[PDB]
């Protein structure tokens, strides 16, 4: 079966056999950054592509060149953990091998004079840890992926949003990856207009004249010509028949045969069929047929050299009789059939003022740089650098692909710059769409919208840095010292490092990691964000980008999204969702070849998802594969309908394909409303890890995937046997099958003990395996925070009853019994670092000392002689943690305290107490103290003590891992030596250091002895190489901020118990604040006396229709009911046959469930270990949308001898009398969310005030003051509370002379105010007067 | 105001006032030096925009 998952097997109620296992959930981040940093030979991705994009850098003249050979990534100076402790970025140095090639002065082809190649250093790039996070200035950050608009061309419209006339106005838009936007559009009178960078619009033919097209070439491109070969007969007209489609023929058509349609009729396609079947191509038209027709060619008089008719000029009868004198047989004319063809280009050329290339370039220049006089070689360089220069415009590979795919070209690859035919084809497709021959694009289709991830954004910022360097190198190669300099005298690392640094630290998408539980991390890494640089802004994003498109099915979760202002802008990647090679989300589907649903899987993106018919995952099918129903529900084009079995092309790969990893953990998701499911998926990510992790009795089976794919747990890399288990480490003796030759064969796993998360929780790894037991590859070795035997345990299985209890659960409140506080269920450890920074003031240095002025001697009891607290010291609020004093001067005390000094003689001290104290309300244990001392500052006794502790710990850990590895190497040597020439009773006496030089006869295994001895010697060498480095990193100085002398960081560990106010929740959106902690004897209780742990409200179920929280309860009653039977069989010490029988009955139960747990193969010891793990309730798995039916829940309730209705009779704890109706009692999985009332409660009487305005400061960190804002002032104005309002304005915020008087009056027993003018009004009168305006106060 | 970390924190008004006074003293300088009209016109425009 397994070994870690037959300790305790979760009974699966899933019924559809899974075809694709859930992928590695963090492969988005890791695959993206791997594509960024790794070496690319062909130069397509990451750093190699960014170097080849810029290099070789040629000089302005061409005498020297700077080319790029290769790059390398250095070794990071500090480990991940050393970067988290020293508060520095975990990065790697970028060592680029450059080459300066210099020629002679006059060379034939650029023949070289010298080549100077060397390894320049340009910046450090932050490395990504093996869990997808970045350690940047010590904090772990996640660069959230971005859903942005794919580069390409997009045709769209406004649906009569303009001119109030119902005329849809179309617009094409070329969006490059990097470059300038290019818009074409139709105005309400069908004139094509162009815009660049969304500035004011030109006529669209101005850009056609910027290209070298003349007017007749423009009309040749955008039209087809009708030709009048004016024969003897009046205007003998050449004709193709289909031009006659759908118009009111007021002229008759006669050509050697019938008069086809009489004058004054509209003609139909059968008339065109008639004209093409009798084969007439040359007809006779009336004379006025040219009146209105627009000429196509520039008709000139060869007699006089004068153009008698310009192109795009409306031919008339007088002008026709004019040019007919010149002897012109053929008259070309633009064929404009209304409602099939447009005058748009001709009526556009009638508007623009330009008639040649230079005038159009000048008009584009006046559009672009207005008020600057345009010259020829300035305008004709501006236009050529807008769209057609490969360094100022990039329609990238995905942009070129989408561009060619829109215009229906055959190639997917091309150039990154625009061309003549690209712009012509965009205008042509826009005109086609205007003529009804196409349809506008959907801008929020997930095939018009793509994923830009950490490894692409980082490459973009690195390329920005490289071009900031390229400009400087071009400014440097234009000098005359080119014969003495090396390429590292030209490269400033600060541009590159500053670009990469600001992206990784201070971007909108590089976010402080949400580290509450494993789920918070694993769903912050799978985050998609429409916001960010190059995306939307949450204030200007409409209702339509925030919607659930039909193309999010399988690519983006519909449920998991925020609830505030950015909803639908922050999305969560669904479970099986993947990215294309271009960044388009694709999702897997099983091919259905002939009705047999093949287990072959194909990842379809959103554009190719609509060509097919795709069956549901809920579609029934036999073992053969055919759909047993005959009308399968499928998705054809974005709409859903029933199809025959033969039409179906693909099928969903799973039922949790559509929901994210956060919403796939909600059991019975199919019974909750989508609002409540959204709230539950958002509130699971806020649960804090409790002391002892408790698995869900009702889960969905995704617990193990979420707990393993997040790096919170310790997973065995190679299988083996646990050689040594300990709360701080696990030592695994690897199996002989899995160890390489020349290797100790021992894996050591050092566990994270009691460290601070980003959200001040405790992350702490507990060993799961026992000593000597066998482990496999992939088995969870040590739990993490919120992890129970490798499953994801975000909360505790509290026994709930749904009944109203005396109003204490009114309006979503939670009644909690005292046995939840007794049993320490939702007690959570929280770790806070507090920093005491001894700085260098200008009056002198602040010192960390224990002789603090005017403080008690009992307050300094917990400080050591160096002024710092002891480790293990139980501190409460106000206690001094780090004793510090700042030197002060210029006292200038008032005469009364001067006399007070004269009488008693206590002379004031020159120093001020600035020590670090525990914040009020916080009470915990000091668990760590770090002292960072600036180099040159002498270390106090505590810093030297901490350093000797660190050196002893480093030396002891390195020596212990060397002892472990060398013991494994010697065990392997002993195993090899007894494989042939066995000295097993001679080798036990020979000491271990003598076994290397023991020559064995060399059949083959002497090569093994060579490699093991070499491994041992290099292990001994590496131990010293690591120990000296650890010693020099410990005893070295710290690179602190300038001005600070030392920093003492005290790590408090608080234990927050549950209390009224703490927000608790379930997985189904049923949040609630604890309103009372009720005694055990006050709770309702069943006929056996078991009281109820938590009493929830029935009224919170039916209106917000989260029925899942009922079924989870009814099934959690069933699960625990199984456990309460196994526990009973474990108390009577029943034989293992009866336990095996009952556990097999509990695992066999269900209607054609997909799992088979056969306990016939379990040994009796494995059955007993399983039954001991199941005595607290059998964990049940209800997968999302194929989970447990209500009939199966009732069958499980019958198995555990429970009432199948899920409802028992309770009795009141206080009065002992039975509640009149049966109450729903069961086991709901409750979560303690991170909104704790300890961190919410805050109050001030007075305190620090603001600087410019004298109002109180902001928040509970700055001691607060509540904003009595504008709506509350209207509330006090709606009552007649004029004095309450006045004292809220004057003597509580701003009346500086008035609030001190108010305090002294409240103290002297006189509740009276003397309000003056608020200081903000004086600030306002002084700020209006600093404008040229005289505002006054009259009297 | 000096922040505790040794660094200072100013309002944008000091930057704007300092720009005004720099351009104004330079305009008085140019008017004393009898600069050409192109330079003093550009300086008057800069003082107006500051």
């Amino acid at each position: 079966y397994s070994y870690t998952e037959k300790k305790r097997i979760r009974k699966d109620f899933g019924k559809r056999p899974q075809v694709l296992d859930v992928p590695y959930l963090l492969s988005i981040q890791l695959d993206s950054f791997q594509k960024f940093i790794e070496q690319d030979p062909e130069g397509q991705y990451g750093l190699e592509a960014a170097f080849r994009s810029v290099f070789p850098i040629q000089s302005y003249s061409g005498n020297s060149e700077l080319q790029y050979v290769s790059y390398r990534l250095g070794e990071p100076v500090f480990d991940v953990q050393e970067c988290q402790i020293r508060g520095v970025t975990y990065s790697a140095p970028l060592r680029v091998k450059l080459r300066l090639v210099i020629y002679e002065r006059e060379a034939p082809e650029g023949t070289v004079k010298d080549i100077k190649e060397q390894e320049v250093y340009m910046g450090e790039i932050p490395l990504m840890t093996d869990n997808g996070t970045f350690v940047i200035n010590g904090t772990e950050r996640v660069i959230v992926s971005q859903l942005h608009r794919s580069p390409g061309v997009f045709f769209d419209s406004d649906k009569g949003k303009t001119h109030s006339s119902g005329k849809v106005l179309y617009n094409a838009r070329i969006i490059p990856y990097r470059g300038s936007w290019l818009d074409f559009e139709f105005d309400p009178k069908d004139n094509l207009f162009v815009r660049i960078d969304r500035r004011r619009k030109l006529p669209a033919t101005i850009i056609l004249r910027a290209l070298n097209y003349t007017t007749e070439q423009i009309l040749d491109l955008f039209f087809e010509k009708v030709i009048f070969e004016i024969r003897d007969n009046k205007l003998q007209m050449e004709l193709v028949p289909e031009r006659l489609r759908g118009e009111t023929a007021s002229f008759d058509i006669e050509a050697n045969g019938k008069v086809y349609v009489e004058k004054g009729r509209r003609i139909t396609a059968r008339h065109i069929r008639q004209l093409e079947k009798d084969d007439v191509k040359l007809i006779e038209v009336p004379v006025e047929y040219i009146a209105g027709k627009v000429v196509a060619k520039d008709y000139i008089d060869e007699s006089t050299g004068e153009l008698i008719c310009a192109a795009n000029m409306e031919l008339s009868l007088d002008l026709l009789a004019k040019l007919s004198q010149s002897g012109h047989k053929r008259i070309e004319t633009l064929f404009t059939n209304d409602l099939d063809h447009g005058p748009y280009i001709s009526e556009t050329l009638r508007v623009d003022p330009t008639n040649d290339r230079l005038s159009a370039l000048v008009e584009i220049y006046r559009m672009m740089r207005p008020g600057e006089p345009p010259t020829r070689e300035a305008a004709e360089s501006l236009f050529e650098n807008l769209f057609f220069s490969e360094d100022r415009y990039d329609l990238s590979a995905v942009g070129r692909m989408k561009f060619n795919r829109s215009l229906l070209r055959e190639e997917i690859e091309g150039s990154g710059i625009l061309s003549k035919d690209d712009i012509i084809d965009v205008m042509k497709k826009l005109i086609d769409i205007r003529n009804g021959k196409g349809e506008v694009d959907d801008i929020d289709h997930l095939g018009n919208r793509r994923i830009r991830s950490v490894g692409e954004m980082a490459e973009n910022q690195f390329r920005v840095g490289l071009v900031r360097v390229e400009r400087a190198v071009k400014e440097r190669l234009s000098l005359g010292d080119l014969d003495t300099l090396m390429p590292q005298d030209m490269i400033n690392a600060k541009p590159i490092s500053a670009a990469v640094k600001e992206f990784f630290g201070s971007s909108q998408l590089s976010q402080f990691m949400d580290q509450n539980n494993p789920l918070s991390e694993i769903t912050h890494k799978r985050r998609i964000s429409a916001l960010g640089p190059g995306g939307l802004t949450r204030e200007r994003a409409g209702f339509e980008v925030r919607d659930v498109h039909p193309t999010h099915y399988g690519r983006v979760c519909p449920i998991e999204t925020p609830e505030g202002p950015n909803i639908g802008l922050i999305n969560s990647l669904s479970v099986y969702a993947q990215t294309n090679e271009y960044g388009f989300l694709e999702t897997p589907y099983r091919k259905v070849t002939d009705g047999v649903v093949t287990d072959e899987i194909h990842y379809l993106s959103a554009i190719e998802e609509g060509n097919y018919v795709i069956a549901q995952a809920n579609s029934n099918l036999d073992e053969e594969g055919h759909f047993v129903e005959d009308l399968v529900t499928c998705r054809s084009k974005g709409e859903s309908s029933l199809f025959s079995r033969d039409q179906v092309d693909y099928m969903d790969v799973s039922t949790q394909q559509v929901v994210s990893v956060g919403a796939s953990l909600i059991p019975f998701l199919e019974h909750d409303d989508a609002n409540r499911a959204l709230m539950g998926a958002n509130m699971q990510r806020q649960a804090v890890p409790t002391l002892r992790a408790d698995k869900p009795l009702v889960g969905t089976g995704m617990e193990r995937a979420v707990a393993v794919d997040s790096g919170v747990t310790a997973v065995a890399k190679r299988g083996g046997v646990v050689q040594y288990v300990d709360a701080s480490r696990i030592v695994i003796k690897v199996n002989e099958d899995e160890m390489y030759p020349g290797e100790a064969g021992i894996d050591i796993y050092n566990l994270t003990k009691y460290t601070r998360s980003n959200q001040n929780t405790c992350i702490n790894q507990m060993p799961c395996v026992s000593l000597g037991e066998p482990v496999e590859r992939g088995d969870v070795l040590a739990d993490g925070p919120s992890t129970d035997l490798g499953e994801l345990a975000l909360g505790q299985n509290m026994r709930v009853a749904f009944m109203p209890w005396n109003g204490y659960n009114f309006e979503d409140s939670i009644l909690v019994s005292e046995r939840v506080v007794q049993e320490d269920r939702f007690t959570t450890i929280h770790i806070q670092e507090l920093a005491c920074v001894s700085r260098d003031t200008k009056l002198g240095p602040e010192e960390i000392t224990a002789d603090i002025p005017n403080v008690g001697e009992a307050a300094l009891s917990k400080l050591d002689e160096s002024g710092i607290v002891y480790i293990g010291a139980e501190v409460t609020g106000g206690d001094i943690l780090v004793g510090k004093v700042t030197p002060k001067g210029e006292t200038q005390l008032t005469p009364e305290e001067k006399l007070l000094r004269a009488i008693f003689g206590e002379k004031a001290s020159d120093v001020k107490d600035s020590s670090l104290r525990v914040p009020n309300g916080v009470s915990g244990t000091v668990i760590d103290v770090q002292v960072f001392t600036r180099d040159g500052v002498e270390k106090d006794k505590r810093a030297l003590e901490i350093e000797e502790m660190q050196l002893k710990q480093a030396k002891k850990d390195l020596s212990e891992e060397l002892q472990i590895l060398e013991a494994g190497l010697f065990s392997r040597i002993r195993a090899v030596l007894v494989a042939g020439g066995v000295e097993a009773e001679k080798l036990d006496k020979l000491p271990r250091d003598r076994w290397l030089e023991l020559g064995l006869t060399d059949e083959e295994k002497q090569n093994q002895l060579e490699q093991l001895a070499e491994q041992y010697d290099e292990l001994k060498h590496e131990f010293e190489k690591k120990l000296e480095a650890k010693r020099r990193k410990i005893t070295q100085g710290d690179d602190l901020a300038p001005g600070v002398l030392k920093i003492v960081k005290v790590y408090l560990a608080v234990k927050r118990r549950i209390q009224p106010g703490d927000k608790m929740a379930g997985r189904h959106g049923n949040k609630g604040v604890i309103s009372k902690i009720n005694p055990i004897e006050d709770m309702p209780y069943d006929e056996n006396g078991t009281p109820v742990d938590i009493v929830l409200n029935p009224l919170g179920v039916p209106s917000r229709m989260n029925i899942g929280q009922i079924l989870e309860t009814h099934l959690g009653m069933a699960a625990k009911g199984i456990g309460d039977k196994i526990n009973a069989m474990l108390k009577q010490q029943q034989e293992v046959a009866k336990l095996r029988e009952f556990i097999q009955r509990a695992y066999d139960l269900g209607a054609d469930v997909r799992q088979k747990v056969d306990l016939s193969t379990f040994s009796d010891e494995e059955v007993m270990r399983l039954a001991e793990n199941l005595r607290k309730g059998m964990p049940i798995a209800t997968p999302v949308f194929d989970g447990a039916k209500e009939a199966e829940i009732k069958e499980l309730l019958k198995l555990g001898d429970l009432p199948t209705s899920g409802q028992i009779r309770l009795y009141d704890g206080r009065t002992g009398e039975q509640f009149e109706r049966p109450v729903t009692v069961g086991y709901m999985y409750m979560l303690k969310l991170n909104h704790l009332v300890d961190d919410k409660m805050h109050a001030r009487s007075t305190g620090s005030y603001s600087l410019v305005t004298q109002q109180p400061l902001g928040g509970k960190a700055q001691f607060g003051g509540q904003r009595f804002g504008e709506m509350e002032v209207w509330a006090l104005e709606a009552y007649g509370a004029a004095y309450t309002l006045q004292e809220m304005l004057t003597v509580k915020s701003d009346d500086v002379n008035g609030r001190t008087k108010m305090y002294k009056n409240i103290v002297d027993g006189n509740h009276q105010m003397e309000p003056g003018m608020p200081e903000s009004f004086n600030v306002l009168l002084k700020e209006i007067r600093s404008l040229g305006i005289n505002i006054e106060l009259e009297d | 105001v000096p922040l505790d970390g040794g660094r200072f924190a100013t309002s944008d008004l000091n930057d704007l006032y300092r720009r005004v006074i720099n351009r104004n003293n330079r305009l008085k300088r140019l008017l004393d030096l009898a600069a050409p009209d192109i330079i003093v016109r550009n300086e008057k425009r800069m003082l107006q925009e500051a």
Binding site: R369, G371, E372, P373 | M46
Partner: peptide
Amino acid sequence: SEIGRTTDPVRMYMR
């Protein structure tokens, strides 16, 4: 001419 088309004093200086 270009008089009155711009507001940037840099452009007026270069003009």
